[PDB]
């Protein structure tokens, strides 16, 4: 019983027009309804190579976008869940869009001239925007597939790494390699506000309906949540020592230190997930700085290279001595991580060739394996979950982009059975 706390209610009783401003948690619990054993798995083989991102507009017809290191924004349809995704239009870049000055503030050429990296569709469906190493954020009209506005990043290091829209509102959040986070209105095509703070390049950003975004640096081992208006931020550091793991296990495998945090998806307001290069999928919580649940290597250890290859020496018993057994081994990276919002379910993608989908526990203090989607192989970059149907019984369509390389560079060995194209999979109930 307090004086001002009554008065705080009275002033806030009159408060109006807060929908996205009000928080929303995990309320949707279809994770036990899903059947992964019998879920159909369809793959397509597109002509372009080194695919980089997929984004899909969903109405309040369904759609699909792909972008590949052939510098080709490509226009697709997925609206029938029983058939493979279909070509509608495209736009290949090239070298005819190389800027004239090559040094000025202006980079106002309409097309991408080198190495797109990321795409995102505007949640009204009216626009779609592409970004890359060409340090140009070009938004595209959907219908005629034409450059509607080109945005120079105005910095020499400002290569775009990820694009993140707000749900149902065209505030566009964009990550850049020069430790910048540019924010954008798309209806007015104007630069909002610039955010600062990572020690490393900013590989991934994701958002929800609220005016908050979560970004990760690569090598810094920090994940930062943001307030856009107040321009304040949080800091989530990992730092699990192997010696705290080993001496924990000495009361009775391998443990890995974390090279990077690469990808991040935001599942609800109070929790999210991050991918690492040492196979860690850390469930994070806003109340804590440490991860609320660390799950070590998801896709497993990276395949060990063959004993004959590494030595180059004819003595066979000498070849195994150079490998140093367990010391040489490495894990799969986590190169894809996306949850359908406010749900108990998220999908991880790598080049183990199994989109390992996880179930969040209902107490939201750990998560747990649902299953695998083994039809894909090779490096997987992005994940977009598209739902349809009624309220309770929902048909889904996971779409993942498969390249023979990573988004950012090669950094890869012994890729096999991997074709460039979209992996489509419908899970029912």
């Amino acid at each position: 019983f307090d004086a001002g706390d009554l008065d705080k209610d009275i002033i806030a009783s009159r408060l109006k027009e807060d929908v996205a401003e009000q928080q929303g948690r995990v309320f949707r619990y279809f994770g036990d309804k899903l059947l992964i054993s019998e879920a159909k798995q369809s793959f397509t083989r597109v002509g372009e190579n080194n695919l980089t991102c997929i984004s899909c507009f969903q109405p309040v017809r369904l759609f699909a976008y792909t972008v590949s290191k052939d510098l080709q924004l490509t226009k697709y349809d997925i609206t029938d869940f029983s058939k493979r995704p279909k070509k509608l239009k495209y736009a290949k870049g090239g070298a005819k869009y190389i800027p004239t000055s090559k040094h000025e503030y202006e980079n106002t050429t309409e097309g991408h001239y080198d190495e797109i990296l990321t795409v995102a569709a505007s949640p009204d469906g009216k626009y779609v925007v592409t970004g890359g190493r060409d340090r140009k954020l070009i938004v595209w009209s959907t219908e005629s597939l034409s450059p509607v506005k080109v945005i120079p990043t105005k910095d020499r290091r400002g290569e775009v790494l990820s694009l993140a829209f707000r749900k149902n509102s065209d505030q566009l959040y964009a990550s850049c390699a020069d430790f910048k986070i540019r924010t954008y209105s798309i209806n007015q095509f104007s630069q909002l506000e610039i955010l600062y703070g990572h020690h490393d390049i900013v590989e991934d950003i994701s958002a929800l309906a609220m005016e908050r975004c979560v970004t990760v640096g690569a090598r810094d081992r920090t994940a930062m949540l943001w307030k856009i208006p107040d321009e304040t931020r949080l800091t989530f550091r990992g730092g699990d020592e192997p010696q705290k793991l080993l001496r924990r296990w000495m009361k009775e495998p391998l443990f890995f230190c974390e090279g990077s945090i690469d990808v991040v998806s935001m599942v609800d307001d109070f929790h999210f997930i991050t991918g690492s290069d040492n196979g860690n999928i850390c469930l994070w919580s806003l109340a804590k700085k440490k991860p609320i649940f660390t799950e070590r290597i998801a896709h497993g250890i990276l395949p060990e290279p063959s004993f004959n290859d590494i030595s180059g020496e004819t003595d066979e018993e000498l070849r195994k001595r150079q490998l140093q057994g367990k010391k040489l081994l490495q894990p799969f990276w986590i190169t894809s991580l996306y949850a359908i919002p406010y749900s108990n379910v998220f999908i991880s993608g790598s080049w183990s060739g199994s989109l390992k989908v996880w179930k969040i526990s209902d107490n939201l203090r750990s998560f747990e394996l649902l299953g695998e989607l083994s039809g894909a192989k090779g490096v997987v970059t992005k994940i977009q979950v598209v739902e349809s149907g009624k309220h309770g019984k929902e048909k889904f369509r996971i779409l993942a982009s498969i390249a023979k390389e990573h988004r950012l560079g090669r950094w890869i060995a012994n890729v096999s059975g991997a074709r460039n194209g979209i992996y489509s999979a419908v899970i029912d109930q």
Binding site: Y105, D155, R156
Partner: protein, 175 residues
């Protein structure tokens, strides 16, 4: 007085100290050492008074955890030296490496401390969002990666300054 003059104003050595510290770090006068040296003498007398005191006395425990953590964030004390025996040993070169003259120069961008001094006072280098034009800025540890040319700066990604824009208009009317 924000700075105290030393007890020995004119020695053979103290004059050849302040030749070097002003020489290497590009200082303006003798004064900018003593602003640093007086503040350092606050910190160093604080660390000796914590070592008069016993361990498990909370004034050595908490303020010792404060001062070491505080000196990590300004980047003077390295993180590995997380004991009070190291905050005594830091001399006044450790503060001057964190000034914006040297930290621009030692990051690149300059070719010289005196050239890095000129880029600060003409508003070209930027620390995060806000453009900074005072060279004794004392960059923190978290702020170190972010020092870059301003977007409204002709060494950055802006229009050229007046002495190119006058010359570029001059070659058009001449030709």
């Amino acid at each position: 007085k924000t700075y105290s003059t030393p007890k020995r104003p004119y020695e053979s050595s103290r004059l050849d100290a302040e030749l070097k510290l002003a020489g290497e770090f590009g200082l303006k006068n003798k004064k900018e050492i003593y602003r640093i040296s007086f503040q350092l003498s606050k910190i160093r007398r604080a660390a000796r008074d914590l070592l008069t005191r016993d361990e498990k006395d909370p004034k050595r425990l908490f303020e010792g955890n404060a001062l070491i953590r505080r000196l990590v964030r300004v980047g003077v004390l390295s993180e590995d030296k997380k004991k009070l025996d190291y905050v005594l040993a830091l001399k006044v070169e450790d503060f001057l490496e964190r000034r914006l003259q040297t930290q621009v120069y030692k990051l690149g961008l300059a070719k010289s401390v005196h050239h890095a001094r000129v880029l600060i006072t003409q508003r070209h280098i930027a620390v995060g969002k806000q453009i900074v034009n005072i060279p004794s800025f004392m960059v923190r540890l978290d702020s170190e990666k972010h020092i870059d040319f301003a977007p409204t700066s002709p060494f950055g990604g802006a229009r050229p300054g007046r002495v190119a824009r006058r010359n570029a208009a001059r070659k058009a009317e001449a030709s």
